[PDB]
Structure formats: C-alpha cells, structure tokens
Amino acid sequence: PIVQNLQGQMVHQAISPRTLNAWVKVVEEKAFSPEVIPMFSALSEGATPQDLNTMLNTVGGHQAAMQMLKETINEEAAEWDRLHPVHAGPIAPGQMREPRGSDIAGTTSTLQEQIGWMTHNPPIPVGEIYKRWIILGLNKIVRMYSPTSILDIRQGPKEPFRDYVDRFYKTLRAEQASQEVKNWMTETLLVQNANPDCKTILKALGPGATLEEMMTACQGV
Amino acid sequence: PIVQNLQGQMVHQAISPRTLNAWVKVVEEKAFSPEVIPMFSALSEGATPQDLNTMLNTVGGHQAAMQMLKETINEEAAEWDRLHPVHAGPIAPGQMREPRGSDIAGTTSTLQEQIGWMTHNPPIPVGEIYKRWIILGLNKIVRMYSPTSILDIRQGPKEPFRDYVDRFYKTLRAEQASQEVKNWMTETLLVQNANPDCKTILKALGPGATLEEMMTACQGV
Amino acid sequence: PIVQNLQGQMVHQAISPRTLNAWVKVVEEKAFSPEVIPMFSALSEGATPQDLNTMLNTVGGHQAAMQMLKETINEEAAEWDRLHPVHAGPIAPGQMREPRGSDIAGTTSTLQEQIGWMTHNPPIPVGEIYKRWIILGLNKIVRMYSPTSILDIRQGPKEPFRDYVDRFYKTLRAEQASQEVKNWMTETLLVQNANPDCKTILKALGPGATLEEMMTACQGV
Amino acid sequence: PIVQNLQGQMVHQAISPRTLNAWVKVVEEKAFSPEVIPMFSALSEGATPQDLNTMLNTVGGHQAAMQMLKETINEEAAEWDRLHPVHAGPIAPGQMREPRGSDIAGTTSTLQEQIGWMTHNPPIPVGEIYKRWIILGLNKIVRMYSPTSILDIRQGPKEPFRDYVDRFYKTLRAEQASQEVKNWMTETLLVQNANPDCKTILKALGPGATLEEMMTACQGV
Amino acid sequence: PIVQNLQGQMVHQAISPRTLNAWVKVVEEKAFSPEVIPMFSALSEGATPQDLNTMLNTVGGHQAAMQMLKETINEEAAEWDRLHPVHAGPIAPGQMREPRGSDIAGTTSTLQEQIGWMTHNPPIPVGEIYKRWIILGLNKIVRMYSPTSILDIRQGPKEPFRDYVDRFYKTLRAEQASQEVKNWMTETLLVQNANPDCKTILKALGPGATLEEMMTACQGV
Amino acid sequence: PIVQNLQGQMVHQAISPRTLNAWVKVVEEKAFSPEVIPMFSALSEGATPQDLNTMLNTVGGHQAAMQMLKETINEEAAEWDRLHPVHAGPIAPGQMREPRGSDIAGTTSTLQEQIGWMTHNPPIPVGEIYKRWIILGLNKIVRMYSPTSILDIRQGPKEPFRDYVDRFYKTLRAEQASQEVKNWMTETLLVQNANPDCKTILKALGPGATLEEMMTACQGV
C-alpha cells in the first residue's frame, strides 16, 4: 500500500503475508459477525484497489456472500458511471485519464495507473472509494447472515439482564437502518421486551435513566 | 500512530495487525478483569482517536459493556462541550479550528485533521483526551463486571491466608472509590474479615505492622 | 525479490522464510482449492523466476499436480520459442541478450541476469511471464482437482438455499471456461437446479431479479 | 525505552506488545520462580519508570505479591527521601529539578520529564533505580513463595544424587542471605544431608573435591 | 550472511534464530523427503560457510545421515585439493591467500577471512561451493532414505490413478540418475506398471499424449 | 550485542526477547543433547558477557548443571588470572585498564566498560573468551548427561543397521576425547559391535570402505 515515508514519497509495497493470514483467519473464525467490518477497515488502511481485490479473492468459503459482493460493487460502479460521465475529449497537456467505474476497482486498471492516481496532486481516493463500496456490500452481507429481526428479542424466564442486553445489542448492531430509529428501539424495546418482574422494576425506575442505571437496578431478580 | 522518528517528524502509520490481535485476545481471554485497563493504556501508546475507535469497534462480544462505553464517551464529550464553548468567529490567520466534543473522538474528524492537531505547536492531546474518556468508561465497566462489594470478603474455614489476601486485593482493585478509603479498608478489614484463629494471631501481633509481617505470621494455622 | 526502495534502486533480497512457510501451509491445508491461485499471486509479488521456482519446488506432496505444472510451463516455454525467434546476430553495443523460453524460467538463467533483465530500461517482465505460465498451469490443476462438472449441482430435499448457492458457486469458480457462459449458467441453472418449492417461488418472483432477491425470497421454505 | 540510535540520540518509543505478552506469560506459567528476576532484568533493558510501572500493573494475579511490591517500592522511595533531602531553592539557570522518591517511580513524573532526566548530561538513572527497587522487592517475593528453608533438604531412600542436588540448588537459589554463608552450606550440607551410603562414599572421597567429582562418584548407588 | 545493502556494502550479520528454527522444524517434521533440498537451498541464500556449518550441526537426530554428510564434504574437499594445487609461493603485493579444500568449509577459516574472500573483487563463491557440496551429499542422503527403486511401483487393484501417479513421481523424485533416463521411465513405465483395465485404456489412447490426457482419460475405472 | 551497522559503528542493543525465548525453549525441550552447544554458539553471536550471563541465568531447571557451569567458568577465570598477571602500574595516557578473570565475565564489569573493551582498537574479545569458557563447561555438562560410554553400544537381535549407526553416533558425539581416537572407534567398533550376520557381511566387504558402503551393504538382513 501507499505508506507515508518521512522522506516525502508514497510508493506501494507488497502487502505483508501477515495481513493476508490475519484477514483469512478473521473471515473463517469470526464468520461474518459485525466486527468483520472494522476488521476489514483496519486491515485495509491505505491499500490499493488491487490489494483490496486480492483480499476479497483470498477467502474461499462463503461464495454466496462473495457473489453478493461482486454484485454490489458492480451496482456501485454502474451508479458511479451514471454519476460521472465521460469528458469525451483527448488527453490534456500534463493531464491523466479519468478513472471509470470499472477502473475504480482493480479489474480494468494497472497498479502503476492506480499509484499515479492516488499520488498525483490533487489526489483522488480510488482505493477509498473501492473500500466504501466493499463496506456497503459487507453491510448487506452481515444483514443477511443475521437471521433475526430487531423485534424478536425478548427476555427469557430467568435469563440474566446482562445477557439479555448482550443479545439485544448483538441484534441491534446486526440490524442497521438509521440512527434516530436505533435510539427509538434503544429507549423503549429494551424495557418493552423483558420479563414481568424486570418490566415492573424498570418502570419502577421510570424513564429518563441510563442503561447503566437499568442494569444496576436489574442486577438481581 | 504518531511515532517519534529520529529525523524530527511525527507521521501516522497504520496500526500493526499484531496490536489489534493482541487487544482482541486480551479482551476475550482476560474478559474485563482490572488488568485490561493497563493493557489498553499500553497498547494505545500514541494512538490517534481514529485508532482508538478502531480498537473499540474491533471487539464483537460484550455489547452491553460497549454500549456503556459509547454512552460514557458521549457524556464526556457533552461535558467537554460545556467546559469549552465556541469562539464564534472566523478563522484567524495561520490558525486551525478548535476541536469540539465530537471532534475529539474520531467520528467527526479526519485523520489529517487529527494529525495536524496533535503535531502542530503548541500540541493538543486529542488522542490522550479520548484515551482518558475511554479509561473512565472502562472503570465503570470493570466495576459492573465485579459482582461483589468490598465488605463481603471473609476468610473461610481452612482457606489459606495467601489466597484470602489474593481475593481481598482482587476485590479491592475491582472496587475503586478513592485512596484514603482504600487504605482505610486495607489496614482494618484485612484482619477484620478473617478466621477466628487468624484474628487471634493478627491481634497478637497487633497494629503497626506490614502486610508481609501479617502473612509471614499467618503462614501456618 | 525486486523491492522498490525510496532511494530509487531495485535490488533482490532473499525471500523471507515466513513467505515460504505461508505458501507451504496454504498448499497443504487448503489443498488445491481455487483460492490457492490468488494466494500464489499475492505471495509472489515482484518475485524473481528463481524465487518462483523455489516456491514451486518447496511443496513435497501432489507430485502429479507438480508434473502437470512442469509440463505446462514446458509447453508455455515452447510456445514462447515459436512466438519469439532468435535474432541470430552478435551482441549489439550496450545491449544484453534476449531471454528464451527456457531462460524465462529459472533453469537456464542466473539471478544476476534475471535482475539485469527486470531492472534495465526498458524493463522486461520475465518474472511476470513466469507467473502467468504458472497461473495458467494452476488453472488446469484446480480444474482437475474438482471432480464435478457445472451441470451436476442440484438442490437436495431440505438443503438450505444458502448452502445450495454456496456449493453452486464453489463449482462455478472451479469450472472456468469464459465469462458470458458463466453468466449464462448463473442466470438460469441457479434456479433450474432447485427443489420443487424453490422452483415455484423462484418463478413466482420471475426473471430480472438479483441473487440477493432470490436468497431473501427463498429465506424460508 | 531509550534505544541508542547510531545517529546519536536517545528517544523513547512505545514498548512492543511482544515484550508485554512475554512478561505476562512468564509471570503466569513460571509463577514466581527465581528465574523471573533475570527475566524482568532482561525484558526491562533501558525501560523508563513509566514502562516499568506498566509492566508491573500488567499482571492480574498474585495481588498479595503485588501489594508486597507496592509496599517495598514505597519503603525504598521513603528511604531515598531521607538519603536525598530537598535543596530548598529556586531553579538554577539551565538546571532541571531534582527527582524525589515519588518522582523516581512513574507516579509523580511525566514521560517527558523522565526522558530529559535520563538523557541530559550528566545522566541520572531513574529507570535503573526503579529497577533496583523492583528487584529488591522481587527478592522478598521469591523468598516468600518458597515454603522451605535451606536446612530441610535431605536425600530420600533411593532418590538420585542428580535430583537431590537439583532440589538442593533450587532451594539455595530461593534462599538468599549472603555469599560466604552460601558457600558454607554448599561445602557441608550438600553431603551432610544425604543417604547413608551416599554419606559413606562422600567421606570416602573426603573434602577438597569439586561438585562434579561428587556427582561422578555418586553416579550409581 | 552477506546481504546487499543499497549503500553498496556486503557485511555479514548473525543468522536470525527464525531461520535456524525453520531449518530445524523442517528437518524433524519433513524428515529427509526430497523437498528438504530446496528448503536448504532457500534458507541458505547468501549464507557463509560458517553459517552452513552452524545449520548442519544444529540438527541432533539422523547422525548416520550427518556422518554420510561429514564424509561427503570430506571427499569433495579432497577432490578440490587435487583439482586446485598450492601456488607454492609468498604473498603477492595486495593479494590474499588462496582457500584450500578445508578452508572452503568453515573448519579452517575465520569469518573475517571468508567475508574478505566473498566480498573482494573478483569474488570467489566459497559459500556457494560449500552449498554445492552439501547439496551433493543431501542427494545421496535422500537416495538412501528412499527404500524403493523406480522399477517397483505398480498400480494396485482399485488404487486411483491420481495416487498411483503421486507415488510414482514421489519415487521418481527420490531416485535421481539423469534426465533422458527419467524421461525414459516417464513415458513408458507410467503405463507399463498399471492395472489391467488402466493398461487397456492407456493403449486405447496410445502414445503421443500428455500426462494430463492420461489422467483425464483414466479419471474413472 | 555489538551489531555491525553499515555506517561504521558497533553499539550494543538490548537482546531481543525472541532470542531469550528461543534459548529457553531449546534448553527445556532439547534438554542437554549435544546440539544445545551449537544452539548456544549460534544464539550468542556477538553477544556481550552481560548478555551471556543473562542467557545463563535465564534457565531455571538443571541447577546441578548450572552449578557445574558456575564452577567451570570460575576455574577458567582462575586459570586466566595465573596466565595474565597484573601490570602493577598507573593508567597510561590514552590507555584503558586490562580486564581480569572476573572482569571477563559480567560480574565485575559494567556494560560500558565491556563495550569499550570490545570496540576499541586493537579489539579484545572478552565476550568470545566468556563464550569459550561457557562452551568448555557445556562440554562437561553434556558428557555427564550421557549415561553411556562409547564401548557399550552393540547391535541388537533385529535392530536395523540404520538405527544402530544412529545410536552409535549419538554416543560418539556425546563422548568427546580427541579426533584420532574418534576415528579409531569409527573405523573398528562400528563393525566390532554388530550382530553376527552383520559382522559376517561387514568383513565380507572387508576394510577400506565408506560408511555409505557399509549401510548400503547391510541394507537388508
């Protein structure tokens, strides 16, 4: 990737095999839990689109998820095509060619071209745009891999409030729609979907309290 | 993070995947024992707020604890807003914009802005303030994860004095309120909550002795 | 391999033993699944033909596959011989000798000669051509190791649509012929080779839909 | 820690997570055997007092031992206070403030102050003094963790002389009082605490012999 | 080993313990399969004769094989003595002494002398000659460790053609005599030593076909 | 240790924890087999006497062996004292003090003094002399740990010649007296201590043959 050397140059180097093994092991062990998204966003810091394609083609399993991806980046590139038309002109003096939707990905673009693209001033973040598309696809993937909607989590007979909140926020992280609506579920359905005694003590405390307060109040029975 | 090169420049580099795996394994294996706090404070040496957010979003489990966090940094940012108002003016010549409570975290701030913030002279420790807020939240988290107050530890029938002191200082580390009060429990309840024979020999020694003296006196029965 | 130092020179260094162990472990554990091809293409970034030969001779098992390789690079070199004849002349002033089919591989070529070949301006990618031949052979190897044609995958009695699509795209990745024909299977045989109820609901949705739509429609029975 | 770069500067860098994991694993697996002392002295080469405090707070278990430590460094700092009074004067031109007993540890001292302390000429070894105090405490800790005095080791019925000497020198290393007295036990109690037949052959050899001679003579019965 | 720094100097550094552990683990786990030869040739890139001697003395087991080695390098050095006589003269101005058969190995030669030998212009490859002798000995070792001649491999009753070819090329790699004779076995005994039905279909295809063709024809029964 | 930087300076750096863990694991797993000697000689390349003392004090077990060591370096230092007397004079202009037997080890010598000793021109190899003494002690240690003389190895009833030679050269490596006498055992007792049938075929071949010839002749019964 383009690493910032103190001398003042950004030259790509081959991605360390350590990073590839880390990404692979994360994909297998952690399956497609919501943390794979920050894992990818952290392991792909400054990576080129070719490096991102390498990291995507590295995993062997979950071919349905990878096909959903290969479709999602395809749709994103198609949308970028309609957002960004062709200048329809020759090469201007001292000017490089504008990347297209396919050129944003590593398919129709050489590593030298991508390096010049992301190092020339003003800089264009082709790798960052590819990362954004991949993250958008991973959102749909992690949504599909969660077989439970937000309005199905209810506290069991003697299930601890701690693990109830744990499962509730697992599913909240899995289900992404917005922010205000997430707060909407957070401040009602947390108490709305509890045991009878937990319900009673939660409205004994009433509204206008913090989640820490709810858990320390519902510490026992 | 900002590493001090001998040349005289501080330029961020991508956090090593080794550090991320170390933090993850610590979080899973060591759960949320009090040592996770120095673990975080050591693994986040010089890290940017974006790196801290990456390390926080890395862990998948303990979503209740992570929600307590996301609430605690929210409260800390809100407090910082009321401590630090807006200058309400244009950009001064050769002067950058003052970070806000949200800008302190990596949400509403770019990596370039954070780097300029923590490298311009005079330097402002945005990453250190974010670390302080995260540590303040981890204090509450480790307090909640300990289901035992300080005034519940009592020596068993034939439980060794060594393991009694071990459990006592586990719980003392877990329960944090102050320093003088910690010494207050340390110098009384250590002996106040012992076996009858241990009680007798401890006041046979009397007060004004060291913990080493207590343990070497209570080495046997 | 030839690593681009910021000073402006490309000098070969000994391949790290880490890379060799990574390649070996990939070959053994992952057998010859289609992901070994991007594994090789990533672990051999900038590697010399001698390094590629080292990586090929490293693996001990699958000697039938390695013989298929040693035959495929032989055929590729023979084809390159007939594509590229001999200039049949002495050495021109300030001009090096043109590599042959055997010289492209590391057999009849010294490391110094290869380095001069891939560092002199204009540059010739002898290592890249060797990589291309090895990848062409690995295509045939991965095709042979897959004992199932594309027109044999059919959904079982109560096999989930997710795992059906998984196996279907395993076999699609294994079987490579072209691109338009891959889309041809993708848009028909995916639904053509399903359970009766899945068939009914898939043509209930009809054509002109995405794979994500097919899977979310066939989420249940 | 302060690493000596060839350029001629000593600038602190963040301690590697590898060193922290090594120290932690040593503490857990090797418990508090006498080798943990050279382990600490080797892993803390050039470390700052803040790094030493991080390494001390890293371990979670053995809180009784850590309290003995926190007491021993407290006593050492108090002794250093009475050895080193306050100059009771303003700051001299081009002169820094003298560290105190608490400032020697990382509690009341910033990393910048410690760096200036251990890099200014003439240099003051604040980190080395902290290391010496920690080692003095670890001496008492390893003494307490050994539940056996030197005058209790006696050769069993058919216990080999090799393992007898092994256990004897385990306990000798555990019990530290001086050097001349260690030689005193070494040259008598080694033979004084043996089996009857071993006694007979040892005084058959007589005094004025080496430990190698004793073991090769007592190789058999 | 002599690593080529970009500055323009070749100075030996201590071999990494990682390389030694890699060589050791390869020797133990992989025994003496034919791949240990490319393993050694890759792990000993640029190594000095002293480094090669260290790597040879590192392994503890297979002392019969190591004695065969110590004999083979002895014979190679003796042959080099008779190939290269003594100049029988004093030291010429600005000229170093010519290495002998023993001086080629690290026995009678200091590291400084070897470094000057392999860094002075014109360069002499003492380490490469030692590597060649060690490889020649490893050839005999791997031949001895294979307890099966080439004319003993015959396809079993229902042994797959894949594994038959696997074992055949295992033994072909183990048995090294030449190249033309290897092709001689390759193109006849592959089919000559098969099951009756495999024989029939192989001569149904006839000669003038590739090994890939043989295996895809004999895919089934 | 003193690493040769290309700039032209030799400055000690803290020994990597990797080297310490490697030495420790070698000592525990491989016990004290003869290969621990080249292990130590390879892991202690360029190490200072203080580093050697750290590596020696690192191991916890085998205190009898470590006491034999601490005695052997003591005897070596005492011998060096009688070989090298005191100059009995003041410090000469621009001249450092001559190391003594104790100063050769890291006991009575500071790291700065040792660095100046092994970096000043002309250089004195204090670390190398300490390494030589430690190796001399390890010779005696590995001799003691081998409970079998050279004249006890005899081929069993149906023990393979390969494993017979293996055990024979294990014990030959363990028992070190000289070189000519080692050849003396090598060329007779190898055949002198065999099975009756092996005896018959070995003198069927007769003398004047190589060990490879003996093993290939005695391949079978």
Query: Is the separation of the CB atoms in A182 and A220 below 8 Å?
Result: no
Boundary (domain end) residue, out of D86, D117, D145? D145
Q: Residue C116 falls within a domain, yes or no? A: yes
Q: According to the entry, how was the structure determined?
A: cryo-EM
Say yes or no: E100 and E179 in one domain: no
Q: Which two tokens stand for residue F56?
A: 């020696």
Say yes or no: F160 and F188 in one domain: yes
Shortest Cα distance, chain B CAs vs residue D57, angstroms = 6
Say yes or no: F110 and F40 in one domain: yes
- Alpha carbons F209 and F140: distance in angstroms, whole number: 33
Q: Residue E218 falls within a domain, yes or no? A: no
Please state the φ and ψ torsions of residue F83, each to the nearest 5 degrees: -75, -35
- Alpha carbons E34 and C18: distance in angstroms, whole number: 20
Q: Do A166 and B140 touch (CB under 8 A)?
A: no
Q: Residue F11 falls within a domain, yes or no? A: no
- Alpha carbons D17 and D203: distance in angstroms, whole number: 54
Q: Which two tokens stand for residue E62?
A: 């297979």
- Tell me, in Å, the resolution of the deposited structure: 2.8
- Nearest Cα neighbor of E27 from E15, E14, E43 is E43
Whether a cis peptide bond, with omega within 30° of 0, leads into D122 is: yes
- Alpha carbons E153 and A93: distance in angstroms, whole number: 69
3-state percent breakdown (helix, strand, coil) of chain C, nearest 5:
60, 5, 40
Say yes or no: F86 and F188 in one domain: no
Q: Residue E213 falls within a domain, yes or no? A: no
Task: For residue B71, give the 3-state DSSP assignment.
Answer: helix
- Nearest Cα neighbor of D14 from B128, B123, B42 is B42
- Alpha carbons F139 and F158: distance in angstroms, whole number: 33
| Total CB pairs under 8 A between chain D and F | 67
Residue of F3, F27, F29, F39 for testing the chain E interface, max E β-carbons within 10 Å = F39
Q: Do C38 and A58 touch (CB under 8 A)?
A: yes
Q: Do C12 and E18 touch (CB under 8 A)?
A: no
Q: Which residue of E has its CA nearest to F36?
A: E58
Q: Which residue of E has its CA nearest to C69?
A: E212
Neighbours of F107 (CB within 10 A): 12
Q: Residue F210 falls within a domain, yes or no? A: no
Q: Which two tokens stand for residue F129?
A: 């002399």
- Alpha carbons A193 and E30: distance in angstroms, whole number: 59
- Alpha carbons A3 and C110: distance in angstroms, whole number: 32
Q: Do B173 and D71 touch (CB under 8 A)?
A: no
Nearest to F38 among E21, E54, E147 (CB): E54
- Alpha carbons B18 and A91: distance in angstroms, whole number: 45
Q: Which two tokens stand for residue E90?
A: 């004093």
Q: Does A212 touch chain B (CB under 8 A)?
A: yes
Q: Residue F27 falls within a domain, yes or no? A: yes
Q: Which residue is listed with tokens 């961020």? A: B12
Query: Is the separation of the CB atoms in B100 and B83 below 8 Å?
Result: no
Query: Is the separation of the CB atoms in B130 and B136 below 8 Å?
Result: no
Say yes or no: E125 and E161 in one domain: no
Say yes or no: D161 and D124 in one domain: no
CATH number of the domain that A49 lies in? 1.10.375.10
In C59-179, which residue ranges form alpha helices assigned H by DSSP? Answer: 63-83, 101-104, 111-119, 126-144, 161-174
**What 8-state DSSP symbol labels residue E122?**
S
Supply angle C-alpha E49, E54, E57, rounded to 5.
125
- Nearest Cα neighbor of E133 from E106, E170, E155 is E106
Nearest to D162 among F7, F21, F64 (CB): F64
Task: For residue D4, give the 3-state DSSP assignment.
Answer: strand
Q: Assign residue A63 a region: left if phi > 0, alpha if psi is -120 to 50, beta otherwise?
A: alpha
- Nearest Cα neighbor of B80 from B66, B96, B100, B57 is B100
- Nearest Cα neighbor of D124 from D91, D88, D100 is D100
**What 8-state DSSP symbol labels residue D10?**
E
Say yes or no: A159 and A123 in one domain: no
Shortest Cα distance, chain E CAs vs residue C217, angstroms = 40
Q: Residue C135 falls within a domain, yes or no? A: yes
Q: Residue A21 falls within a domain, yes or no? A: yes
Total domains in chain D come to 2
Q: Does E22 touch chain F (CB under 8 A)?
A: no
Q: Does E18 touch chain C (CB under 8 A)?
A: yes
Q: Does E58 touch chain F (CB under 8 A)?
A: yes
Q: Does A59 touch chain C (CB under 8 A)?
A: yes
Q: What is the residue-wise DSSP string for D146-211? A: ----GGG----SS--HHHHHHHHHHHHHH--S-SHHHHHHHHHHHHHTS-HHHHHHHHHH-SS--H
- Alpha carbons F53 and F109: distance in angstroms, whole number: 12
From chain B, pick out residues whose CB is under 8 angstroms from the CB of A35: 57-60
Boundary (domain end) residue, out of B145, B163, B178? B145
Supply angle C-alpha B22, B28, B32, rounded to 5.
105
- Nearest Cα neighbor of B34 from B130, B135, B131, B129 is B135
Q: Report yes or no on chains F and D touching (3+ CB pairs under 8 A).
A: yes
Q: Do E9 and F4 touch (CB under 8 A)?
A: no
Say yes or no: A84 and A164 in one domain: no
- Nearest Cα neighbor of F110 from F56, F59, F48 is F48
Query: Is the separation of the CB atoms in E124 and E117 below 8 Å?
Result: yes
Q: Does F68 touch chain D (CB under 8 A)?
A: yes
Residue B14's alpha-carbon distances to A15, A25, B115, in angstroms, are: 13, 20, 13
Q: Do F38 and E21 touch (CB under 8 A)?
A: no
CATH number of the domain that B168 lies in? 1.10.1200.30
- Nearest Cα neighbor of B104 from B85, B83, B129 is B129
Q: Which residue is listed with tokens 């599909």? A: A144
Say yes or no: C54 and C87 in one domain: yes
Q: With the C-alpha atoms ordered C199, C203, C208, C211, is the resulting torsion angle positive or negative?
A: negative
Task: For residue F126, give the 3-state DSSP assignment.
Answer: helix
**What 8-state DSSP symbol labels residue B84?**
S
Q: With the C-alpha atoms ordered D78, D102, D18, E54, is the resulting torsion angle positive or negative?
A: negative
In C157-218, which residue ranges form alpha helices assigned H by DSSP? Answer: 161-174, 180-192, 196-205, 211-217
Nearest to E63 among F18, F22, F173 (CB): F173
Structural domain boundaries enclosing A105: 17-145
Burial of B99 (0-12, 13-18, 19+ CB in 10 A): buried
Q: Does F14 touch chain D (CB under 8 A)?
A: yes
Q: Report yes or no on chains F and B touching (3+ CB pairs under 8 A).
A: no
- Alpha carbons D117 and D12: distance in angstroms, whole number: 12
Query: Is the separation of the CB atoms in B64 and B53 below 8 Å?
Result: no
Say yes or no: C104 and C184 in one domain: no
Query: Is the separation of the CB atoms in E126 and E51 below 8 Å?
Result: no
Say yes or no: E32 and E88 in one domain: yes
Whether a cis peptide bond, with omega within 30° of 0, leads into A49 is: no
Q: Does A170 touch chain B (CB under 8 A)?
A: yes
Say yes or no: C119 and C166 in one domain: no
Task: For residue D130, give the 3-state DSSP assignment.
Answer: helix
Q: Do E42 and C20 touch (CB under 8 A)?
A: yes
Please state the φ and ψ torsions of residue C148, each to the nearest 5 degrees: -160, 125
Neighbours of D40 (CB within 10 A): 20
- Alpha carbons B103 and B98: distance in angstroms, whole number: 9
- Per the document, the length of chain E is 221
Task: For residue C10, give the 3-state DSSP assignment.
Answer: strand
Task: For residue F3, give the 3-state DSSP assignment.
Answer: strand
